[PDB]
Amino acid sequence: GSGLKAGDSFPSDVVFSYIPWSEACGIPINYNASKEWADKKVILFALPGAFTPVCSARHVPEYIEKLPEIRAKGVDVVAVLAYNDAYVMSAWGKANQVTGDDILFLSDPDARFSKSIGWADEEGRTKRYALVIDHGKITYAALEPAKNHLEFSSAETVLKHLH
Amino acid sequence: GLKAGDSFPSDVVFSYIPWSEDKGEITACGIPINYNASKEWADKKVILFALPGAFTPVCSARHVPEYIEKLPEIRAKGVDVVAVLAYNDAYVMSAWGKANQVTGDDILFLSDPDARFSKSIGWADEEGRTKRYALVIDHGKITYAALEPAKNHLEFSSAETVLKHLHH
């Protein structure tokens, strides 16, 4: 794909899938990220898969812990992204005890967004990465050097790249 | 696809996480192991049912809960193994198992990696998922095989229908 870097515009027509907040016969609908985020400061972190074990990388739990610090830096939306469908993503959000949309759990259908920028792996999963998108402009972008390497996409690290 | 009388294919391998431990629906540090169904089932009576995906709401198909309700009946008809199959990876399937409050191996939650088995028998869709179907396999021999006519049509693979075929 293309890559993404600071200074780039966030791609247009980026559409994910998700189940909107509450409450259960939730149905997946489109999440038009390009449109929704145009006037927002956003953190988006992607990872290999929902429900990876507790003993492995603490990607999501660290974002939950650092959420007060992230809000203090003026971030409006935090989202986690993976290739799992919106049903699995939504159940994973519940399993992580995230309520009231504090962190959005989004599906990248067939990893098509991730593929379009060259950040999907050989098996159709997203890679592990983070993007800070401020009003449609990328201000932080980092791809982890390996699947279970947690560093450049971590909440701690992303926090150092927020004013 | 598959029909009664046929032999269950050789070298069919699924992925799963054996049940254990504390939390829901998070596996502590479970690790996917190969499940060699062809070999495991050679001397057993088995119900295998597949569906489009883990964590699909019950209001669009009460597939797993009905097998759970019918499990004492199913065992009383001599079935050794009951297994649900889907294209989701073993971590997701294991979580779905806990979310259904299934413990031990009462029902196995198995992954069909990239729907490859389902694909090999022509029972997968274009989206890379398994279709919804059921198989009764008795010591390596298929005695019941039905594919549902639609994705969220639950009839020929339901616990109640499979049971009718067991009782006969």
Author numbering:
A (entry chain A): 1 to 23, 30 to 169
B (entry chain B): 3 to 170
Reported in the publication:
The intracellular Asp f3 is an abundant protein in A. fumigatus. It contains 168 amino acid residues and BLAST searches reveal considerable sequence homology to the thioredoxin superfamily, the peroxiredoxin (Prx) family, and the PRX5-like subfamily. Finally, we provide evidence for the critical role of Asp f3 in fungal virulence, wherein it protects A. fumigatus against oxidative stress in vitro, and in vivo, in a murine model of invasive pulmonary aspergillosis.
The WT protein was captured in its oxidized state, with two intermolecular disulfide bonds across the dimerization interface between C31 and C61 of the individual protomers. The crystal structure of Asp f3 revealed its homodimeric configuration that includes two intermolecular disulfide bonds. Salt bridges between R131 and D91 from the two protomers and additional hydrogen bonds between main chain atoms (T29-V60, A30-V60, A30-C61), as well as residues involved in hydrophobic interactions (I28, A30, F57, P59, V60, V94, Y93, A97) contribute to the extensive interface interactions. The WT, as well as C31S/C61S variant, exhibited close similarity to oxidized and reduced forms of Ahp1, respectively. Disulfide reductases such as a thioredoxin or glutaredoxin return oxidized Asp f3 to its activated, reduced state.
